[PDB]
């Protein structure tokens, strides 16, 4: 019976493991019986997330309902070469691992432009391929970073709201970002941050591709969840 998604992931909540927080990546064994011990799943660190802007808190309990869950070995896309000029993989001092005081979630890649910033972009489309094993469900984790007006213009060539949509399995999501006047930081790494991230997931059923349409600040998916089977959650 599983309680935590990743045993041997100490100091990690189920939502930390679901997002691939640094120090929170490890074996997630199979289980036919599971207890749902968190009604409102919570993170214990990283860059601060505006969790309730999306359904992201259900992700551990969705994984909980599968018999087998595992984090993919390869990146679902090449984030640095994704559309929108060349990107640098952003890291934050809020997300350390054993060999770096900076880092970021292993499920996502912070696409930071490289003096192609100045160009604010019209909406860009990337296709998210199915990479799991033949009969498995793929859960794709993505999101977007936003910041205050001055930092949005510094990181990106735009201080205006960016808009993000996702599509898979006939299910569409849509978002517009927020500049400044953010909620207080909660469930994060504990360092002050002028911006936040919004994190979402989309399910890709066996053999089904995904689509993300984005602008500046996108968090492109890297490591996806490959899940199969069915587990009795209690």
């Amino acid at each position, epitope marked *: 019976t599983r309680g935590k998604l990743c045993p041997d992931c100490l100091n990690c909540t189920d939502l930390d493991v679901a997002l691939g927080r640094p120090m929170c990546v490890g074996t997630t064994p199979s289980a036919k019986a599971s207890i749902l011990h968190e009604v409102k799943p919570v993170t214990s660190g990283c860059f601060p997330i505006m969790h309730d802007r999306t359904k992201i808190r259900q992700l551990p309990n969705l994984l909980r309902g599968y018999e087998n869950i595992r984090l993919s070995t390869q990146n679902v896309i090449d984030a640095e070469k994704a559309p929108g000029g060349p990107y*640098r993989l952003g890291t934050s001092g*809020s997300c350390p691992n054993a060999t770096s*005081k900076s880092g970021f979630f292993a499920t996502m890649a912070w696409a930071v432009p490289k*003096d192609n910033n100045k160009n604010a972009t019209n909406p860009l489309t990337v296709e998210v391929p199915y990479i799991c094993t033949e009969g498995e469900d793929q859960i794709t984790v993505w999101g977007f970073h936003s910041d205050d007006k001055t930092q949005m213009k510094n990181l990106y060539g735009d201080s205006n709201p960016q808009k993000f949509t996702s599509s898979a399995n006939g299910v569409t999501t849509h978002y517009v970002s927020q500049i400044g006047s953010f909620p207080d930081q909660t469930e994060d790494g504990g360092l002050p941050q002028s911006g936040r991230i919004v994190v979402d997931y989309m399910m890709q059923k066996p053999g089904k591709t995904g689509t993300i349409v984005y602008q500046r600040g996108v968090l492109l998916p890297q490591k996806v969840w490959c899940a199969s089977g069915r587990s009795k959650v209690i």
Partner: antibody
């Protein structure tokens, strides 16, 4: 890998000065860069640090509010705009490369400095 | 702010002698300390980084050790070209701070 500081000279107190550091021989925009100064006969003193993009700045308290670090990644130049210059700003100003190509700009974009320039000398005097 | 207390301020030892330089942090900097060598009339050079890693090209007679608040820089067999002032520097937290330096000279 080469760093070449320039722009040092004799300034009257209260005036402004800009030092430039011409980087070459490495991918300059992957790395944080540093300014370190040294009064004659005295030890190394850190001035400023800038992240790989322009979004992360850091200053010693001696210079906060008076100095501005900046960079041109296309030109591959690190800048240090010094204003309201004081006689104790007199020093040899070193350009320095970070050993690690950190992508972060919020915290800890600073590690050991593996390449230094030969410095440009600034004398603040009337 | 973290002071780096470096000692001795100056020393002089014969060729082939052992040189021991210590750097103290007023607070825990963990691993993030480096050692620089500044020869007379020259700019600093990285010898040691992350308290024990020996930078490219620098000889095996140089070695560093320590963590937390205490760090040790050692020249195992002093050589005439080691005439310099050596500096420790912490990069664990802002503001970045250096040690006062340690002048090494040959007793010949």
């Amino acid at each position: 890998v080469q760093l070449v500081e320039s722009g040092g000279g004799l300034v009257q107190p209260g005036r402004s000065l800009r030092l430039s550091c011409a980087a070459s021989g490495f991918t300059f925009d992957d790395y944080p860069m540093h300014w370190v100064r040294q009064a004659p006969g005295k030890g190394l003193e850190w001035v400023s640090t800038i992240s790989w993009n322009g979004a992360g700045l850091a200053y010693a308290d001696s210079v906060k509010g008076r100095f501005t670090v900046s960079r041109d990644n296309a030109k591959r130049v690190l800048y240090l705009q010094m204003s309201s210059l004081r006689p104790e700003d007199t020093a040899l100003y070193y350009c320095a490369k970070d050993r690690v190509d950190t992508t972060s700009w919020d915290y800890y974009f600073h590690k050991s400095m593996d390449v230094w320039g030969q410095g440009t000398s600034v004398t603040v005097s009337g | 702010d973290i002071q780096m207390t470096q000692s001795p301020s100056s020393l002089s030892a014969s060729v082939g002698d052992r040189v021991t330089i210590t750097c103290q942090a007023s607070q825990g900097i963990g691993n993030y300390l480096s050692w620089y060598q500044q020869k007379p009339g020259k700019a600093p050079k990285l010898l040691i980084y992350d308290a024990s890693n020996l930078e490219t090209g620098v000889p095996s007679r140089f070695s560093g050790s320590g963590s937390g608040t205490h760090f040790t820089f050692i020249i195992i067999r002093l050589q005439p070209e080691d005439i310099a002032t050596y500096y420790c520097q912490q990069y664990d937290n802002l503001p970045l701070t250096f040690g006062g330096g340690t002048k090494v000279e040959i007793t010949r």
